[PDB]
Structures are given as structure tokens and as C-alpha cells.
Coordinates of C-alpha atoms in Angstrom, one line a residue:
Chain A
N29 CA 84.9 148.5 76.2
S30 CA 85.7 148.4 79.9
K31 CA 88.9 149.7 81.2
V32 CA 88.6 147.0 83.7
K33 CA 90.8 144.3 81.5
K34 CA 92.4 142.2 84.5
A35 CA 91.3 140.2 87.0
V36 CA 93.8 139.4 90.2
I37 CA 93.1 136.7 92.1
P38 CA 95.0 135.8 95.3
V39 CA 95.5 132.2 95.5
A40 CA 98.9 132.5 97.5
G41 CA 97.0 130.8 100.8
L42 CA 97.7 127.8 102.4
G43 CA 94.3 126.3 103.3
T44 CA 94.1 125.6 107.0
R45 CA 90.5 125.5 107.2
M46 CA 90.3 122.7 104.6
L47 CA 92.8 120.5 106.2
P48 CA 94.0 117.5 105.5
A49 CA 93.1 117.7 101.8
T50 CA 95.0 120.5 101.2
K51 CA 98.1 119.4 103.1
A52 CA 99.9 118.9 99.3
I53 CA 97.2 120.5 97.3
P54 CA 96.0 123.9 96.9
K55 CA 92.4 124.5 98.4
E56 CA 91.7 126.4 95.0
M57 CA 91.9 122.3 92.9
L58 CA 89.1 120.5 95.6
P59 CA 86.9 119.7 93.0
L60 CA 83.5 120.7 92.8
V61 CA 82.3 117.5 91.6
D62 CA 84.8 117.0 88.4
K63 CA 86.0 120.6 88.0
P64 CA 88.3 122.3 90.3
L65 CA 86.7 125.4 92.5
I66 CA 89.7 127.7 90.6
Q67 CA 88.2 126.4 87.1
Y68 CA 84.7 128.0 88.1
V69 CA 86.2 131.2 89.2
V70 CA 88.4 131.7 86.2
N71 CA 85.0 131.0 83.6
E72 CA 82.8 133.5 85.8
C73 CA 85.8 136.2 85.0
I74 CA 85.9 135.4 81.1
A75 CA 82.0 135.6 81.8
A76 CA 82.2 138.8 83.3
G77 CA 84.2 139.5 79.4
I78 CA 87.8 139.7 81.5
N79 CA 90.4 138.4 79.5
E80 CA 93.6 138.5 81.3
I81 CA 94.3 136.8 85.0
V82 CA 96.7 137.4 87.5
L83 CA 97.3 135.0 89.8
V84 CA 99.2 136.5 93.0
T85 CA 100.7 132.6 94.4
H86 CA 102.8 130.8 96.3
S87 CA 105.8 128.3 95.4
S88 CA 103.7 125.0 96.4
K89 CA 101.1 126.0 93.6
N90 CA 102.3 124.9 90.3
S91 CA 99.2 122.7 89.9
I92 CA 96.8 125.5 89.1
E93 CA 98.9 127.0 86.4
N94 CA 99.4 123.6 84.9
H95 CA 95.9 122.8 85.2
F96 CA 95.1 125.8 82.3
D97 CA 98.5 125.1 80.6
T98 CA 98.8 122.5 77.9
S99 CA 99.4 118.8 79.9
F100 CA 101.7 117.0 77.5
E101 CA 101.6 113.7 78.5
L102 CA 97.8 113.6 78.9
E103 CA 97.1 115.1 75.7
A104 CA 99.8 112.0 74.2
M105 CA 97.6 109.7 76.1
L106 CA 94.4 110.5 75.0
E107 CA 94.0 109.3 71.4
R108 CA 87.6 111.5 71.9
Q109 CA 85.5 114.7 73.0
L110 CA 87.6 114.3 75.6
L111 CA 90.9 115.6 74.1
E112 CA 88.8 118.2 72.8
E113 CA 87.4 119.3 76.4
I114 CA 90.4 119.5 78.1
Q115 CA 91.9 121.5 75.6
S116 CA 89.2 123.8 75.7
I117 CA 89.7 124.4 79.4
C118 CA 91.5 128.0 78.7
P119 CA 90.2 129.5 75.6
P120 CA 93.3 130.9 73.6
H121 CA 92.2 134.6 73.9
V122 CA 92.4 133.9 77.7
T123 CA 95.6 134.5 79.2
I124 CA 96.6 133.6 82.8
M125 CA 99.9 135.3 84.5
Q126 CA 101.2 135.0 87.6
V127 CA 103.7 136.5 90.5
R128 CA 104.4 135.0 93.8
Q129 CA 103.3 136.6 96.8
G130 CA 106.7 138.2 99.1
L131 CA 105.8 137.1 102.9
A132 CA 102.6 135.7 104.5
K133 CA 100.8 138.7 104.5
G134 CA 97.2 139.9 104.0
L135 CA 94.7 140.7 101.2
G136 CA 95.8 143.9 100.3
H137 CA 99.6 143.0 100.2
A138 CA 98.6 140.2 97.6
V139 CA 96.6 142.9 95.3
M140 CA 99.8 145.1 95.7
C141 CA 102.3 142.0 94.4
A142 CA 99.7 142.6 91.3
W143 CA 100.1 146.4 90.3
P144 CA 103.5 145.8 88.3
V145 CA 101.1 143.9 85.9
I146 CA 98.5 146.1 85.9
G147 CA 99.8 149.5 86.4
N148 CA 97.4 152.5 87.6
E149 CA 94.2 151.5 86.0
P150 CA 90.8 149.9 87.2
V151 CA 91.3 146.3 88.9
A152 CA 88.7 143.1 90.0
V153 CA 90.0 141.7 92.6
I154 CA 88.7 137.9 92.8
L155 CA 88.7 135.8 96.1
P156 CA 89.0 131.7 94.6
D157 CA 87.3 130.2 97.7
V158 CA 84.0 131.8 96.9
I159 CA 81.8 130.5 93.5
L160 CA 79.4 132.3 92.0
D161 CA 76.9 130.1 91.5
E162 CA 76.4 130.2 87.8
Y163 CA 73.0 128.4 87.1
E164 CA 70.6 131.4 89.8
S165 CA 72.1 134.1 88.3
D166 CA 73.6 135.1 84.6
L167 CA 77.5 135.3 85.1
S168 CA 77.6 137.3 82.0
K169 CA 75.1 140.4 82.8
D170 CA 75.0 139.9 86.8
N171 CA 76.9 140.3 89.2
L172 CA 80.8 140.9 88.5
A173 CA 79.3 141.8 84.7
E174 CA 77.1 144.0 85.7
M175 CA 79.6 145.5 88.7
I176 CA 81.9 146.1 85.7
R177 CA 79.5 147.9 83.3
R178 CA 78.5 150.1 86.2
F179 CA 81.8 151.1 86.8
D180 CA 82.0 151.9 83.3
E181 CA 79.3 154.1 84.1
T182 CA 79.9 155.9 87.1
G183 CA 83.4 155.2 87.4
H184 CA 82.5 154.3 91.4
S185 CA 84.4 151.2 92.9
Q186 CA 81.6 148.4 93.2
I187 CA 82.3 145.9 96.6
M188 CA 79.8 143.0 96.5
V189 CA 78.0 142.4 99.6
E190 CA 75.0 139.9 100.7
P191 CA 72.9 139.7 103.3
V192 CA 74.3 136.8 106.2
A193 CA 72.1 135.8 109.5
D194 CA 75.5 136.8 111.9
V195 CA 76.7 140.5 111.7
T196 CA 79.6 139.7 113.6
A197 CA 81.0 136.8 111.6
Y198 CA 82.1 138.7 107.8
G199 CA 83.2 142.2 106.9
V200 CA 80.4 144.5 106.8
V201 CA 79.9 147.7 105.0
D202 CA 77.9 150.7 105.7
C203 CA 75.1 152.4 103.5
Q204 CA 73.9 154.5 105.7
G205 CA 70.8 152.4 105.4
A206 CA 70.0 152.7 102.3
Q207 CA 67.6 150.4 100.2
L208 CA 69.1 147.7 98.4
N209 CA 68.0 144.7 96.5
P210 CA 69.8 142.0 94.1
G211 CA 71.3 143.5 91.0
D212 CA 71.4 147.4 93.1
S213 CA 74.5 149.5 93.4
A214 CA 74.3 152.4 96.2
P215 CA 76.9 154.3 97.9
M216 CA 78.5 153.1 101.0
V217 CA 79.9 155.1 103.5
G218 CA 82.2 152.7 105.7
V219 CA 83.7 148.8 106.6
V220 CA 84.0 147.4 109.5
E221 CA 85.9 143.8 110.8
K222 CA 83.8 141.5 112.4
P223 CA 81.5 144.2 114.3
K224 CA 80.1 143.7 117.1
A225 CA 75.8 143.4 117.6
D226 CA 76.0 146.9 118.4
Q227 CA 78.5 148.6 116.2
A228 CA 77.5 146.4 112.8
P229 CA 75.9 149.4 110.3
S230 CA 74.0 146.5 108.4
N231 CA 73.9 142.9 107.6
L232 CA 75.1 142.8 104.0
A233 CA 78.4 141.2 104.1
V234 CA 81.3 141.2 101.7
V235 CA 81.4 138.7 99.5
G236 CA 84.9 138.5 97.9
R237 CA 84.5 140.1 94.7
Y238 CA 85.9 143.9 94.2
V239 CA 86.0 146.4 91.0
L240 CA 88.2 149.1 92.2
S241 CA 89.3 152.4 90.6
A242 CA 93.1 152.6 89.3
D243 CA 92.5 155.4 92.9
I244 CA 93.7 152.3 94.8
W245 CA 97.0 151.8 94.4
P246 CA 98.7 154.7 95.5
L247 CA 96.7 154.1 98.7
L248 CA 97.6 150.9 98.9
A249 CA 100.8 152.0 100.2
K250 CA 99.8 152.2 103.8
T251 CA 99.7 150.3 106.6
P252 CA 96.7 149.3 108.4
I253 CA 98.2 144.9 104.3
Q254 CA 94.6 144.3 104.5
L255 CA 92.4 145.4 101.7
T256 CA 89.3 146.9 103.2
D257 CA 91.3 149.2 105.2
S258 CA 92.8 150.6 102.1
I259 CA 89.1 151.0 100.5
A260 CA 88.3 152.9 103.8
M261 CA 91.1 155.7 103.0
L262 CA 89.6 155.4 99.2
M263 CA 86.0 156.7 100.2
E264 CA 87.0 159.4 102.4
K265 CA 88.8 160.4 98.6
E266 CA 86.0 159.2 96.2
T267 CA 82.3 157.4 96.2
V268 CA 82.7 154.0 96.8
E269 CA 79.6 151.8 96.1
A270 CA 78.3 148.4 97.4
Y271 CA 76.7 145.8 95.2
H272 CA 73.9 143.5 96.3
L273 CA 74.8 140.1 94.8
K274 CA 72.6 138.1 92.2
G275 CA 71.2 134.2 92.9
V276 CA 73.4 132.3 95.2
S277 CA 77.0 132.2 96.3
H278 CA 78.6 129.2 97.9
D279 CA 81.5 129.7 100.4
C280 CA 83.7 126.6 99.6
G281 CA 86.7 128.0 101.7
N282 CA 85.0 126.2 104.9
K283 CA 84.3 122.4 105.0
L284 CA 80.4 122.5 105.0
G285 CA 79.9 125.5 102.2
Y286 CA 82.5 123.2 100.3
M287 CA 80.2 119.8 101.1
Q288 CA 77.1 121.6 100.2
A289 CA 78.0 123.0 97.2
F290 CA 79.6 119.5 96.0
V291 CA 76.0 118.2 96.3
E292 CA 74.1 121.3 94.5
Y293 CA 76.6 121.3 91.8
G294 CA 76.4 117.5 91.7
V295 CA 72.5 117.8 91.2
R296 CA 73.0 120.1 88.4
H297 CA 75.7 118.2 86.2
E298 CA 74.6 117.9 82.9
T299 CA 75.4 114.4 81.8
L300 CA 75.2 112.7 85.9
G301 CA 72.9 115.1 87.8
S302 CA 69.6 113.1 86.9
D303 CA 71.1 109.8 88.5
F304 CA 73.0 111.6 91.4
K305 CA 70.1 113.4 91.9
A306 CA 67.8 110.0 91.7
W307 CA 70.0 108.4 93.9
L308 CA 70.2 111.1 96.1
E309 CA 66.5 111.1 96.8
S310 CA 66.2 107.2 97.3
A311 CA 69.3 107.3 99.7
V312 CA 68.0 110.1 102.2
Chain B
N29 CA 103.7 87.1 112.0
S30 CA 102.7 87.3 108.4
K31 CA 105.5 87.0 106.1
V32 CA 103.0 89.5 104.2
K33 CA 105.1 92.4 105.3
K34 CA 104.5 95.2 102.6
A35 CA 101.1 96.2 100.3
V36 CA 102.1 97.4 96.9
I37 CA 99.7 100.5 95.3
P38 CA 99.9 100.8 91.8
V39 CA 99.4 104.9 92.0
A40 CA 101.2 106.2 88.4
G41 CA 97.8 105.9 86.5
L42 CA 96.5 108.9 84.7
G43 CA 92.9 109.3 85.9
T44 CA 91.0 109.5 82.5
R45 CA 87.5 108.8 83.8
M46 CA 87.8 111.4 86.5
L47 CA 89.0 114.4 84.1
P48 CA 89.0 117.5 84.3
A49 CA 89.6 117.7 87.8
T50 CA 92.7 115.3 87.1
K51 CA 94.1 117.0 84.7
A52 CA 96.8 118.8 87.1
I53 CA 96.1 116.5 89.8
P54 CA 96.5 112.8 91.3
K55 CA 92.8 110.7 91.4
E56 CA 94.0 110.0 94.4
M57 CA 94.1 112.8 95.9
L58 CA 90.8 113.5 95.0
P59 CA 89.0 114.7 98.4
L60 CA 86.5 112.0 99.7
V61 CA 85.1 115.0 102.1
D62 CA 88.0 116.5 104.0
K63 CA 90.7 113.6 103.1
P64 CA 92.0 112.5 100.0
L65 CA 91.9 108.8 98.6
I66 CA 94.7 107.7 99.2
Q67 CA 95.1 108.3 102.9
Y68 CA 92.1 106.1 103.3
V69 CA 93.4 103.1 101.4
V70 CA 96.8 103.4 103.4
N71 CA 95.1 103.5 106.7
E72 CA 93.3 100.1 105.2
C73 CA 96.9 98.8 105.2
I74 CA 98.0 99.7 108.2
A75 CA 94.5 98.5 110.0
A76 CA 95.4 95.0 108.1
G77 CA 98.7 95.2 109.6
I78 CA 100.9 96.3 106.9
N79 CA 103.6 98.8 107.8
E80 CA 105.3 99.2 104.3
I81 CA 103.6 100.5 101.8
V82 CA 105.5 100.3 98.0
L83 CA 104.0 103.4 95.9
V84 CA 104.4 102.8 91.8
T85 CA 104.1 106.2 91.0
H86 CA 104.2 108.8 87.8
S87 CA 106.8 112.2 87.8
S88 CA 103.9 114.0 88.6
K89 CA 101.9 112.6 91.6
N90 CA 105.0 114.2 94.1
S91 CA 102.3 115.6 95.8
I92 CA 101.2 112.0 97.0
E93 CA 104.3 111.3 98.8
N94 CA 104.2 115.0 100.2
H95 CA 101.0 113.8 102.4
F96 CA 102.6 111.5 104.4
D97 CA 105.7 113.1 104.5
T98 CA 106.5 116.3 106.5
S99 CA 104.7 119.5 105.4
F100 CA 107.5 122.2 106.1
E101 CA 105.5 125.6 106.1
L102 CA 102.3 124.0 107.0
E103 CA 103.3 123.4 110.4
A104 CA 105.7 126.3 110.8
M105 CA 102.4 127.8 109.9
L106 CA 100.2 126.0 112.9
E107 CA 101.3 128.1 116.0
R108 CA 96.6 123.4 118.7
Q109 CA 94.8 119.8 117.4
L110 CA 95.3 121.0 113.7
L111 CA 99.4 120.5 114.1
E112 CA 99.1 117.4 115.9
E113 CA 96.2 115.8 113.6
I114 CA 98.4 116.4 110.2
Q115 CA 101.3 115.2 112.2
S116 CA 99.5 112.1 112.8
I117 CA 98.8 111.5 109.1
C118 CA 101.8 108.4 108.8
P119 CA 102.4 106.7 111.5
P120 CA 106.2 106.8 112.9
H121 CA 106.0 103.2 112.7
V122 CA 104.8 103.2 108.9
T123 CA 106.8 104.1 106.3
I124 CA 106.1 104.6 102.6
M125 CA 108.3 103.6 99.9
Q126 CA 107.9 104.9 96.1
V127 CA 109.8 103.3 92.9
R128 CA 108.5 105.1 89.5
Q129 CA 106.9 102.6 86.7
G130 CA 108.6 102.7 83.6
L131 CA 105.7 102.7 80.3
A132 CA 102.4 102.9 81.0
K133 CA 102.1 99.6 80.7
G134 CA 99.2 98.1 83.1
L135 CA 98.6 96.3 86.2
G136 CA 100.7 93.4 86.2
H137 CA 104.2 95.4 85.2
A138 CA 103.1 98.3 87.8
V139 CA 103.3 95.0 90.5
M140 CA 106.7 93.8 88.6
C141 CA 108.2 97.3 89.3
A142 CA 107.8 96.8 92.9
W143 CA 109.6 93.3 92.7
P144 CA 113.1 94.5 94.0
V145 CA 111.3 96.4 97.0
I146 CA 110.0 93.4 98.4
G147 CA 111.9 90.6 96.6
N148 CA 110.7 86.3 96.6
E149 CA 107.8 87.3 99.5
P150 CA 104.4 86.9 99.5
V151 CA 102.7 90.5 98.5
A152 CA 99.5 92.6 99.0
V153 CA 98.4 94.6 96.0
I154 CA 95.9 97.4 96.5
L155 CA 94.2 99.2 94.0
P156 CA 94.4 103.0 95.1
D157 CA 90.2 103.9 93.8
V158 CA 88.7 101.3 95.3
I159 CA 87.6 102.2 99.1
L160 CA 86.3 99.9 101.3
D161 CA 84.0 101.1 103.8
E162 CA 85.5 101.5 107.3
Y163 CA 81.8 102.1 109.0
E164 CA 80.7 98.7 107.5
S165 CA 83.8 96.7 107.8
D166 CA 86.5 96.6 110.7
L167 CA 89.5 96.6 108.8
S168 CA 91.3 95.6 111.4
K169 CA 90.2 91.9 111.1
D170 CA 87.8 91.7 107.6
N171 CA 88.9 92.3 104.3
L172 CA 92.9 92.8 103.4
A173 CA 93.3 91.8 107.3
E174 CA 91.1 88.6 107.1
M175 CA 93.0 87.6 103.1
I176 CA 96.4 88.1 105.2
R177 CA 95.5 85.6 108.3
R178 CA 93.7 83.2 105.8
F179 CA 96.9 83.1 103.7
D180 CA 99.4 82.4 106.9
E181 CA 97.2 80.0 108.0
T182 CA 96.8 78.3 104.4
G183 CA 99.2 79.7 102.0
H184 CA 96.6 80.1 99.6
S185 CA 96.6 83.4 97.8
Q186 CA 93.7 85.5 98.2
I187 CA 91.2 87.3 95.3
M188 CA 89.2 89.6 97.1
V189 CA 85.4 89.3 95.3
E190 CA 82.0 90.8 96.1
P191 CA 78.9 90.3 93.6
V192 CA 77.9 92.8 91.3
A193 CA 76.3 96.0 90.4
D194 CA 76.2 94.3 86.4
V195 CA 77.8 91.7 85.7
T196 CA 79.6 92.7 81.7
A197 CA 80.8 95.5 84.0
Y198 CA 83.9 93.3 85.8
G199 CA 86.8 90.1 85.7
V200 CA 84.4 87.5 87.1
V201 CA 85.8 84.9 89.0
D202 CA 85.3 81.0 88.9
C203 CA 84.4 79.3 92.1
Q204 CA 82.8 75.9 90.5
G205 CA 79.8 76.7 91.6
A206 CA 80.6 77.2 95.3
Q207 CA 78.2 79.4 97.6
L208 CA 80.5 82.4 99.8
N209 CA 79.2 84.4 102.0
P210 CA 80.9 87.6 103.3
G211 CA 84.4 87.1 104.6
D212 CA 84.6 83.7 103.5
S213 CA 87.3 82.8 100.9
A214 CA 87.0 79.6 99.3
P215 CA 89.0 78.2 96.0
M216 CA 88.6 79.7 92.4
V217 CA 89.6 78.0 89.1
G218 CA 89.6 80.7 86.8
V219 CA 88.7 84.5 85.8
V220 CA 87.0 86.2 82.8
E221 CA 87.0 89.7 81.3
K222 CA 84.3 90.7 81.1
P223 CA 81.9 87.7 80.0
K224 CA 78.8 87.9 78.0
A225 CA 75.8 87.3 80.5
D226 CA 76.2 83.4 79.4
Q227 CA 79.8 83.3 79.8
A228 CA 79.7 84.5 83.5
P229 CA 81.0 81.2 85.4
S230 CA 79.3 83.6 89.1
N231 CA 78.6 86.9 89.4
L232 CA 81.6 87.2 91.7
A233 CA 83.7 90.6 90.8
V234 CA 87.3 91.5 91.7
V235 CA 87.2 94.4 93.9
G236 CA 90.9 95.4 93.5
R237 CA 92.6 93.8 96.5
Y238 CA 95.3 90.8 96.3
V239 CA 97.1 88.7 98.6
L240 CA 100.0 86.9 96.5
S241 CA 102.2 84.5 97.1
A242 CA 106.1 84.4 96.1
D243 CA 105.1 82.2 93.7
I244 CA 103.5 85.4 91.2
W245 CA 106.8 86.8 91.1
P246 CA 108.3 84.2 88.3
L247 CA 105.5 84.0 86.8
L248 CA 104.9 87.9 86.0
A249 CA 108.2 87.6 83.8
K250 CA 105.7 86.7 80.7
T251 CA 103.2 88.7 78.7
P252 CA 99.3 88.0 78.2
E253 CA 100.2 95.6 77.8
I254 CA 100.9 93.2 80.6
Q255 CA 98.2 92.4 83.0
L256 CA 97.7 91.1 86.4
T257 CA 94.9 88.4 86.3
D258 CA 96.9 86.4 82.8
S259 CA 99.6 85.9 85.5
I260 CA 97.3 84.9 88.4
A261 CA 95.5 82.5 85.8
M262 CA 99.1 80.9 85.4
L263 CA 99.9 80.3 89.0
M264 CA 96.1 78.8 89.5
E265 CA 97.8 75.9 87.5
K266 CA 100.7 75.4 89.4
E267 CA 99.0 76.2 92.6
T268 CA 95.5 76.6 94.8
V269 CA 94.5 80.4 94.2
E270 CA 91.2 80.9 96.6
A271 CA 88.7 83.9 96.2
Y272 CA 87.2 85.7 99.5
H273 CA 84.1 87.7 99.3
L274 CA 84.2 91.4 100.8
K275 CA 82.9 92.2 104.3
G276 CA 80.7 95.1 104.1
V277 CA 80.9 97.7 101.4
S278 CA 82.8 99.6 98.9
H279 CA 83.5 102.6 97.1
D280 CA 84.4 102.5 93.5
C281 CA 85.8 106.3 93.3
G282 CA 87.6 105.5 89.8
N283 CA 84.4 106.6 88.4
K284 CA 82.8 110.1 88.8
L285 CA 78.8 108.9 89.9
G286 CA 81.0 106.1 92.5
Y287 CA 83.0 109.4 93.9
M288 CA 80.0 111.6 94.6
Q289 CA 78.2 109.1 96.0
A290 CA 80.9 108.0 98.1
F291 CA 81.7 111.8 98.7
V292 CA 77.9 111.6 100.0
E293 CA 78.1 108.7 102.5
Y294 CA 81.4 109.6 104.3
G295 CA 79.8 113.4 104.3
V296 CA 77.2 111.9 106.2
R297 CA 79.1 109.5 108.7
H298 CA 81.8 112.8 109.0
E299 CA 83.1 112.9 112.6
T300 CA 82.0 116.6 113.3
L301 CA 80.2 118.1 110.2
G302 CA 78.0 114.6 109.8
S303 CA 75.1 116.5 111.5
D304 CA 74.7 119.5 110.3
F305 CA 75.6 117.9 106.7
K306 CA 73.0 114.9 107.3
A307 CA 70.3 117.7 108.5
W308 CA 70.7 119.9 105.5
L309 CA 70.6 117.3 102.9
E310 CA 67.2 116.1 104.4
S311 CA 65.8 120.0 104.4
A312 CA 67.1 120.5 101.1
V313 CA 65.4 117.2 99.3

């Protein structure tokens, strides 16, 4: 077993890039075909062997929690496989926990809110608008799953990265020139936010998945809170590696990424994929 | 002016065909690209000249009302165009009203709940999971708009219909043989639910838009759950009830495929993202 027993999911942000759809609903509940973003992400954690999930949330996001809880009126209304399917959304051995975020305070702070739940233990941190494509990787072996096994072997933190066209647009890691392929981990030495062309130490951009040793918690005391800055302070104390994304991710935190993903999952849907796929080809 | 001053929108149903996405959100708030279903439908009413909208709703659907109300924290957050754009979602001259439905009781009952708001006046009834395509019609004078002006001319009820992608799947009107083109209205004599092939009096299926004279209200105090069509039948006995041919196209976003199809079709027409999406599409298949 891993000492990484819980995953933090900061879901407290209002989704201003996905307006007006998110005016009165959480960006985490936008459907990707017929399931909300947050359900794929909780499934990914489950597949990586994490059974305990800590949402850091906002007052207007109750619906995220209702989605995994028992929906009483709905169940009563059902009198098929449908009942069973919605009764399976959260497996009984999986537990969702919730703590509210204080002010509109950034990601490092979001994670800081989850400390009293976790304690001084390593921790998985998961950005809920990035979706790791379950058809192009095996999430029970690759990506988060792999980063946890790597963390258990070495005790080094793991920051997921993927190559990007434009290095000035994301946060970008410094691996001292390192050779890096899908599925590999190698030491990183720094992180810069939206670097200028000449400042970028690489094109490997942070994807939004972190496995952090219990060391970050004391470091999360000091201000920049942004996570990366606190990560930097750990790189000074201890070895922090970067892990190359396997398969594909979809950034569903921008409109186009979300419309792209909807279609891609739309084609793979396992009762409606073929009709949709056909319809598409004829209509395009 | 029309005496049809208000539109009824039954939004109290739990959306069991769109599960699990609708487990904890209203089927009316599923986004079509970047706006929820209900926002297109309210806009359609607005364009037809209706400034007063009556939602018949359920306890778990507050978010529908929040979507058109002021969202206070969000606005404070903003601080450009975005603020203005979300401040425009409901025009100041438009008013949303809400009443809760009693039991899980059907469509005819939903409309009954809206009677104390409206009174003995004609009424527009609008099914919120059918979306009338705004690019293929002009909604300010086709479809609902046209049915209202027709209703003012003649005082005949108007039941929107379109030739179908079946026939056994829908409710189908009897127009005594008549040919009927997009935009026309003609008398109908009956309605049958999911007829067998050999039973169908036509292939013109009810779309989910109704302009009803104040006559339905007394008739709605009688049973077939409680269903609208049956009550409409009782009016056809008493008075002239016409069928109006849909102009342009509709999307049935009450089934998964119809919704995935619509998402793509509106995806390609989106104002700022249509071309990137369209290109991305063509390259990706």
C-alpha cells in the first residue's frame, strides 16, 4: 500500500472562462456527453487506488456533493438498470469529504485548507477541469497510478507534465535538459509561471496532477498562496521529480477544449458512440 | 398587442433520459456549447414578444432561477464585456415567475399550476427540452411568433407540428388529409398518441409548442396522471383548433443523441469559436 491515501480536489473556483453556462452551475458539473467532469476525475483517483477524496469547495457547489450522495427523490422515482447505475456512481468503499475554502485565495491555499483532514502525510492534488483520457492510457497503471508507485519507491514528489506548443502560456518545469518520454520520471530543478521565450527552461508544462510528500505542509505556511512557489521551496530541501503524461489530456477549463473533449468522448460513448460517429461523418 | 402575454414552461421533471448528468443538475441547465438549454428557450419566448415567463418547477431546480437572477458574488468578481454579457442574460423588461408543481403529475397538470398566475386568458406553453433552431428560422416572426399573430387574427388555438423522424415515436395530429407547408396553419380534428403505422392520420408530430385560447382552462379541470393532449381533444369538440407547421428545424435535447447532435451543430455556429471548432472537426474526421 501507499502512504498516499487521499486526493485533494480544489473545486471552489467560479468558472469565469466557461460563462454563461457556469453562471449558476459549477464548472465541475458540465457534462462530458452524459457524465459531469467531476465524475471522470473521481473515477481516475479511484483507479489510481485512492479511496478518500477531499473537495475544497464553495457555498454554491452543493450539487457536486449531491451527485455522489444518495439522490432520494430520484431513486424513489425509478421503478431498471438505471437505478443500479446511479446507485453505483460512488462505490461504497470510496468516501468524499468536504471543507470550504476561505477567501478567493489561489491553489496553494486551497490545498492548505485540506491539511487538517490529511495531516502530515503525503497527498495527491488533482485539478478538476483537466481530464486524463481513459481510453489512451490505463489509469490503473499509468499517470496518477504510476506517480504514486514511483513516490512509494523513491519518496520523491511527482509533478505531472506534458509537452505543449507554446511555452509562454502554462507553468513550465526545469529538468536540466533531461531526456523524458511518456511514463518516465526525472528530477526537476525549478518551475516558472508563464515564462518569456528566453526564460523557459523547457516546453514541459504542468498538467495539474501532483503527488506531494508530507514535506510541503510546513512550506505551505509562507506566501508567494500559489502552489508552485511552495513546491520551489521543497526543491531546495529535497528531490522533486517531473512525470511525463501518458496518453492524452483534455483541458475542459476553456470552451474549445471542452467542446473538443465532448466530441472525442462522444465518439467513444459505449452505447451511442457508433450512431454519433456515423452521424458525424455524414454531417461533416 | 396580443392577449397572449405569458408563456408557461414546465421545468419540474427529473430528467431520467439524460442520466447521470442530470442526477444533481436540472436537465434544463445542460449546456449547449456554453449556454444552458433554458436560456435558448427563454430567448425564443422573448423574440416571440412574450415578456412574462411562468416556470412550473421542482425544489431541486433553484439554479434555473439563479441563472436569470442577479448572481451577486460573480458580478463582484468581474472587475470588461463579460460583466455586461452576464448582466444581459435577462432583459430588464422581461420577468420570470415561478410556481412549484404539486405531485409528479404530467404536463396537463403542470399547466394547471400556472392558471392562478395567468387567469382566464390565452396562454403559450413551451416544452424546455425542445430547442427551435435560431439560425434556420427567424424566431421574431416564425414559429411561436407566427402562431401568436395567427391566434390574434383568428382566435384559434395553435399546436406546433413537424413531419417526422419516425412515426410511432410521437403524438400525431389529424388535419383531415390536408397538405401543409412550413409556416402554414390549418384546422386539425384529433390527436393520437404513438399510433401504429396504419392508424396514423398523418406524419405531422407534435413538437412541444402550444398557443391555447382561454377555453382550455375549464377543460383542464378533467382527467384523461393528467395529460394535455386529452384536454386539447375536448376543446376540438367545442371549438376550432389548428396545427402549425414548424419553420426551420428543432433539436430534441431530451434524448442523449439529440443533445449530442445539437451541441455539435451549435458548436459549429458559435460566434467566436465556430470556425476553430469547425476546422478542428474537419481535420479530426
